Design a protein around this motif. Structure first.
Motif, PDB file in Angstrom:
ATOM      1  N   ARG A  97       0.769  -1.250  -0.139  1.00 29.23           N
ATOM      2  CA  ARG A  97       0.238   0.086  -0.033  1.00 29.23           C
ATOM      3  C   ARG A  97       0.976   1.323   0.024  1.00 29.23           C
ATOM      4  NH1 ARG A  97      -5.027  -1.479   4.030  1.00 29.23           N
ATOM      5  NH2 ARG A  97      -5.592  -3.446   2.895  1.00 29.23           N
ATOM      6  N   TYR A  98       0.401   2.162  -0.746  1.00 33.79           N
ATOM      7  CA  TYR A  98       1.031   3.387  -1.129  1.00 33.79           C
ATOM      8  C   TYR A  98       0.184   4.767  -0.495  1.00 33.79           C
ATOM      9  CZ  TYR A  98       4.067   0.756  -3.998  1.00 33.79           C
ATOM     10  OH  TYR A  98       4.971  -0.481  -4.529  1.00 33.79           O
ATOM     11  N   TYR A  99       0.804   5.502   0.764  1.00 32.87           N
ATOM     12  CA  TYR A  99      -0.210   6.538   1.153  1.00 32.87           C
ATOM     13  C   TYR A  99       0.408   7.810   0.558  1.00 32.87           C
ATOM     14  CZ  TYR A  99      -2.776   3.295   3.802  1.00 32.87           C
ATOM     15  OH  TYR A  99      -3.514   2.051   4.361  1.00 32.87           O
ATOM     16  N   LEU A 100      -0.309   8.707  -0.092  1.00 28.93           N
ATOM     17  CA  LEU A 100       0.098  10.169  -0.497  1.00 28.93           C
ATOM     18  C   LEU A 100      -0.665  11.150   0.224  1.00 28.93           C
ATOM     19  CD1 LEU A 100      -0.215   9.811  -4.481  1.00 28.93           C
ATOM     20  CD2 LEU A 100       1.475   8.502  -2.992  1.00 28.93           C
ATOM     21  N   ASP A 101       0.175  11.673   1.370  1.00 26.07           N
ATOM     22  CA  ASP A 101      -0.551  12.807   2.095  1.00 26.07           C
ATOM     23  C   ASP A 101       0.147  14.124   1.999  1.00 26.07           C
ATOM     24  OD1 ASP A 101      -2.069  10.730   3.501  1.00 26.07           O
ATOM     25  OD2 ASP A 101      -0.290  10.016   4.518  1.00 26.07           O
ATOM     26  N   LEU A 102      -0.686  15.135   1.476  1.00 28.31           N
ATOM     27  CA  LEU A 102      -0.147  16.535   1.359  1.00 28.31           C
ATOM     28  C   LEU A 102      -0.358  17.079   2.959  1.00 28.31           C
ATOM     29  CD1 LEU A 102       0.745  18.952  -0.443  1.00 28.31           C
ATOM     30  CD2 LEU A 102      -1.605  19.524  -0.348  1.00 28.31           C
ATOM     31  N   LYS A 103       0.789  17.326   3.385  1.00 25.38           N
ATOM     32  CA  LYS A 103       0.886  18.030   4.622  1.00 25.38           C
ATOM     33  C   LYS A 103       1.645  19.298   4.816  1.00 25.38           C
ATOM     34  CE  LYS A 103       1.718  14.601   7.910  1.00 25.38           C
ATOM     35  NZ  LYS A 103       2.388  13.648   8.587  1.00 25.38           N
ATOM     36  N   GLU A 104       1.293  19.749   5.895  1.00 26.90           N
ATOM     37  CA  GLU A 104       1.969  21.365   6.215  1.00 26.90           C
ATOM     38  C   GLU A 104       2.666  21.180   7.693  1.00 26.90           C
ATOM     39  OE1 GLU A 104      -1.070  24.349   5.989  1.00 26.90           O
ATOM     40  OE2 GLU A 104      -1.914  23.557   7.700  1.00 26.90           O
ATOM     41  N   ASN A 105       3.797  21.846   7.680  1.00 25.76           N
ATOM     42  CA  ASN A 105       4.407  21.861   9.226  1.00 25.76           C
ATOM     43  C   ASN A 105       5.290  23.173   9.093  1.00 25.76           C
ATOM     44  OD1 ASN A 105       6.999  21.484   7.848  1.00 25.76           O
ATOM     45  ND2 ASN A 105       6.746  19.274   8.192  1.00 25.76           N
ATOM     46  N   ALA A 106       6.140  23.465  10.058  1.00 24.61           N
ATOM     47  CA  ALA A 106       6.812  24.755  10.099  1.00 24.61           C
ATOM     48  C   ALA A 106       7.865  25.038   8.744  1.00 24.61           C
ATOM     49  CB  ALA A 106       7.599  24.876  11.475  1.00 24.61           C
ATOM     50  N   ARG A 107       8.053  23.852   8.157  1.00 19.92           N
ATOM     51  CA  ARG A 107       9.085  23.868   7.183  1.00 19.92           C
ATOM     52  C   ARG A 107       8.481  24.169   5.739  1.00 19.92           C
ATOM     53  NH1 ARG A 107      14.594  24.498   8.616  1.00 19.92           N
ATOM     54  NH2 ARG A 107      14.378  23.792  10.986  1.00 19.92           N
ATOM     55  N   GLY A 108       6.916  24.154   5.707  1.00 21.07           N
ATOM     56  CA  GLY A 108       6.310  24.326   4.623  1.00 21.07           C
ATOM     57  C   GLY A 108       5.380  23.198   4.230  1.00 21.07           C
ATOM     58  N   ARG A 109       4.835  23.296   2.801  1.00 16.95           N
ATOM     59  CA  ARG A 109       4.136  22.350   2.388  1.00 16.95           C
ATOM     60  C   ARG A 109       4.960  21.093   1.971  1.00 16.95           C
ATOM     61  NH1 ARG A 109       0.312  26.757   2.543  1.00 16.95           N
ATOM     62  NH2 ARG A 109      -1.446  26.335   4.037  1.00 16.95           N
ATOM     63  N   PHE A 110       4.452  19.849   1.785  1.00 14.93           N
ATOM     64  CA  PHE A 110       5.126  18.520   1.407  1.00 14.93           C
ATOM     65  C   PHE A 110       4.184  17.480   1.346  1.00 14.93           C
ATOM     66  CE2 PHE A 110       6.160  15.283   4.496  1.00 14.93           C
ATOM     67  CZ  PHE A 110       5.582  16.034   5.697  1.00 14.93           C
ATOM     68  N   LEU A 111       4.684  16.695   0.091  1.00 15.11           N
ATOM     69  CA  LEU A 111       3.984  15.296  -0.015  1.00 15.11           C
ATOM     70  C   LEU A 111       4.629  14.411   0.341  1.00 15.11           C
ATOM     71  CD1 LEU A 111       1.540  14.004  -1.707  1.00 15.11           C
ATOM     72  CD2 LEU A 111       3.296  13.651  -3.490  1.00 15.11           C
ATOM     73  N   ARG A 112       4.257  13.632   1.570  1.00 16.92           N
ATOM     74  CA  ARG A 112       4.551  12.495   1.902  1.00 16.92           C
ATOM     75  C   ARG A 112       4.181  11.372   1.352  1.00 16.92           C
ATOM     76  NH1 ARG A 112       8.684  10.937   4.686  1.00 16.92           N
ATOM     77  NH2 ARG A 112       8.402  11.552   6.827  1.00 16.92           N
ATOM     78  N   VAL A 113       5.112  10.236   0.831  1.00 20.41           N
ATOM     79  CA  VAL A 113       4.652   9.207   0.203  1.00 20.41           C
ATOM     80  C   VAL A 113       5.193   8.234   0.972  1.00 20.41           C
ATOM     81  CG1 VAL A 113       4.853   7.815  -2.146  1.00 20.41           C
ATOM     82  CG2 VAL A 113       4.910  10.452  -2.147  1.00 20.41           C
ATOM     83  N   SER A 114       4.279   7.294   1.544  1.00 17.94           N
ATOM     84  CA  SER A 114       4.786   6.211   2.297  1.00 17.94           C
ATOM     85  C   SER A 114       4.207   4.861   1.725  1.00 17.94           C
ATOM     86  CB  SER A 114       4.087   6.380   3.654  1.00 17.94           C
ATOM     87  OG  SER A 114       2.546   6.283   3.652  1.00 17.94           O
ATOM     88  N   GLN A 115       5.050   3.773   1.797  1.00 16.69           N
ATOM     89  CA  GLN A 115       4.999   2.507   1.261  1.00 16.69           C
ATOM     90  C   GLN A 115       5.051   1.668   2.558  1.00 16.69           C
ATOM     91  OE1 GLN A 115       7.872   0.887  -1.462  1.00 16.69           O
ATOM     92  NE2 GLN A 115       7.698  -1.125  -0.139  1.00 16.69           N
ATOM     93  N   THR A 116       4.036   0.745   2.677  1.00 17.25           N
ATOM     94  CA  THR A 116       3.956  -0.311   3.897  1.00 17.25           C
ATOM     95  C   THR A 116       3.300  -1.522   3.437  1.00 17.25           C
ATOM     96  OG1 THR A 116       2.035   1.182   4.368  1.00 17.25           O
ATOM     97  CG2 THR A 116       3.918   1.293   5.705  1.00 17.25           C
ATOM     98  N   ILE A 117       3.398  -2.629   4.077  1.00 17.53           N
ATOM     99  CA  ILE A 117       2.763  -3.920   3.887  1.00 17.53           C
ATOM    100  C   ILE A 117       2.078  -4.333   5.256  1.00 17.53           C
ATOM    101  CG2 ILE A 117       3.177  -6.355   3.429  1.00 17.53           C
ATOM    102  CD1 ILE A 117       5.345  -5.648   1.298  1.00 17.53           C
ATOM    103  N   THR A 118       2.764  -4.429   6.314  1.00 21.11           N
ATOM    104  CA  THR A 118       2.386  -4.882   7.462  1.00 21.11           C
ATOM    105  C   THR A 118       2.627  -3.859   8.826  1.00 21.11           C
ATOM    106  OG1 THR A 118       3.938  -6.646   8.222  1.00 21.11           O
ATOM    107  CG2 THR A 118       2.061  -7.275   6.879  1.00 21.11           C
ATOM    108  N   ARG A 119       2.095  -3.735   9.494  1.00 22.94           N
ATOM    109  CA  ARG A 119       2.397  -2.972  10.882  1.00 22.94           C
ATOM    110  C   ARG A 119       3.683  -3.380  11.346  1.00 22.94           C
ATOM    111  NH1 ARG A 119      -2.388  -3.022  14.273  1.00 22.94           N
ATOM    112  NH2 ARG A 119      -1.758  -4.753  15.252  1.00 22.94           N
ATOM    113  N   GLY A 120       4.175  -4.494  11.741  1.00 21.84           N
ATOM    114  CA  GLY A 120       5.554  -4.898  12.070  1.00 21.84           C
ATOM    115  C   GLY A 120       6.590  -5.095  10.966  1.00 21.84           C
ATOM    116  N   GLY A 121       6.366  -4.704   9.760  1.00 20.85           N
ATOM    117  CA  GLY A 121       7.277  -4.971   8.655  1.00 20.85           C
ATOM    118  C   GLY A 121       8.077  -3.827   8.130  1.00 20.85           C
ATOM    119  N   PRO A 122       8.812  -3.999   6.873  1.00 17.84           N
ATOM    120  CA  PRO A 122       9.467  -2.827   6.510  1.00 17.84           C
ATOM    121  C   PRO A 122       8.795  -1.766   5.901  1.00 17.84           C
ATOM    122  CG  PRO A 122       9.521  -4.857   4.997  1.00 17.84           C
ATOM    123  CD  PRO A 122       8.834  -5.212   6.244  1.00 17.84           C
TER     124      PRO A 122
END
Ligand SMILES: [Cl-]
Length: 144
Positions: free
Chosen positions: A93-118
DNA sequence: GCGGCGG
């Protein structure tokens, strides 16, 4: 046994991104590497179908980003996704999140399979999404 | 010239 097929390098703010199309015995894929200013590497791997999905979604993220005004900050911490999408390929699964913090706006792209895994993730400054999109398009035009 | 909220 991974044969290199094409490459693109982008300099975005203090980061470098490499987009590499490669092939192994099972097939073709695109590796996306983020190199931080200190040299730290993060990488995700994408099937070509997922890469095209990714490329398609980047435009809506960019449209959304272009329309934003200033963040605004109450007096509690915030995560908050401004905008989210998810892609699936087999058990990845790939999660694409647009987020903001003190360092600006950014696209977070996260790849996952299982909670306990790589897990793997890259973080793309919002200002770089158009350039990144067009780079992905150039490679997609040549492959699959 | 960064820097991206985990277990
Ligand atoms: Cl595919």
């Amino acid at each position: 046994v991974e044969q290199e097929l094409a490459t693109k390098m982008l300099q975005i703010q203090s980061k470098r991104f490499y987009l590499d199309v490669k092939q192994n015995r099972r097939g073709r894929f695109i590796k996306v590497a983020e190199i931080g200013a200190d040299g730290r590497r993060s990488q995700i791997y994408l099937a070509l179908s997922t890469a095209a999905e990714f490329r398609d979604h980047l435009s809506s993220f960019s449209d959304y980003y272009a329309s934003l005004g200033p963040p605004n900050t109450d007096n509690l911490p915030e995560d908050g996704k401004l905008k989210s999408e998810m892609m699936i390929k087999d058990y990845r699964r790939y999660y694409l999140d647009l987020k903001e913090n003190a360092r600006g706006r950014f696209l977070r792209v996260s790849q996952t399979i299982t909670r306990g895994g790589p897990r793997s993730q890259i973080a793309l400054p919002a200002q770089g999404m158009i350039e990144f999109r067009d780079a992905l398009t150039d490679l997609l035009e040549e492959f699959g």
